[PDB]
From a paper:
In this study, we solved the structure of SDN1, an exonuclease that initiates miRNA degradation by trimming their 3′ ends to generate unmethylated miRNAs that can be further turned over. Arabidopsis SDN1 and SDN2 belong to the DEDD 3′→5′ exonuclease superfamily, characterized by an active core consisting of three separate sequence motifs with four invariant acidic amino acids (DEDD). The Arabidopsis SDN family belongs to the DEDDh subfamily. Our structural and biochemical studies revealed the structural features of SDN1 in substrate recognition and provided insights on how SDN1 uses its DEDDh catalytic domain and the RRM domain cooperatively to degrade free small RNAs and trim miRNAs in miRNA/target RNA duplexes or miRNAs bound by AGO1.
To better understand its structure and function, we conducted crystallographic studies and obtained crystals of the SDN1 CTD (residues 309–409) with mutations in three glutamic acid residues (E329A/E330A/E332A). In the CTD structure, residues 315–409 adopts a βαββαβββ RNA Recognition Motif (RRM) fold, but the N-terminal first α helix (residues 309–314) belongs to the linker connecting the DEDDh and RRM domains. In the SDN1 RRM structure, the six-stranded, antiparallel β sheet forms a positively charged surface and packs against two α-helices. Sequence similarities between SDN1 RRM and other RRM proteins are very low, but two aromatic amino acids that are usually crucial for RNA binding in RRM family members are present in SDN1 RRM (Phe318 in β1 and Phe356 in β3). Mapping all these residues onto the RRM surface reveals that they are mainly located on the antiparallel β sheet (β1, β3, β4, β5, and β6), which is positively charged. Interestingly, NMR titration showed that Phe318 on β1 of SDN1 RRM interacts with RNA, but no large change in chemical shift was observed for Phe356, suggesting that Phe356 may not be involved in RNA binding. Another feature of SDN1 RRM is that its extended β4 and β5 participate in RNA binding (residues Thr378, Asp379, Gly382, and Gln385 detected via NMR titration), whereas most canonical RRMs consist of very short or no β4 and β5. Unlike many RRMs, which exhibit strong substrate binding affinities (in the nM range) and sequence specificities, SDN1 RRM binds RNA weakly in a sequence independent mode. Moreover, canonical RRMs usually fold into a βαββαβ topology, while our structural and NMR titration studies show that SDN1 RRM is composed of a six-stranded antiparallel β sheet with the unconventional extension of β4 and β5, and the two extended β strands are involved in RNA binding. Despite its low RNA binding affinity, the RRM domain is critical to the overall RNA binding affinity and processive enzyme activity of SDN1 by working cooperatively with the DEDDh domain—while the DEDDh domain attacks the 3′ end of an ssRNA, the RRM binds the 5′ region of the RNA.
Numbering used by the authors: 308 to 408
Write the structure that this text describes.
Amino acid sequence: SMLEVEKAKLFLHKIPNNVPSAALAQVLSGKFTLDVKQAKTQGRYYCAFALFHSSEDADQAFEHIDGIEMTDSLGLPQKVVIIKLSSGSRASIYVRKMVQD
């Protein structure tokens, strides 16, 4: 049942440190909770996990994400989505499913 929790997770990463993690909720739909990981020492980016109630809700939310669909070198489908920052600045963050089976 650990896997069904994991299949309900989206992985948000390459997030610049100037992005407040609460702003990550603006690019996701549905009902989820965000678990933010601390940036490494002298690190510039951080990542977060969005946990939904099921893999179906996670898949539904990932499809709803407004972002460019791409494939990384590992062959994983990922979406590049723009975060509108209150400073008029912006950030590109990457979103993919946690489990790629």
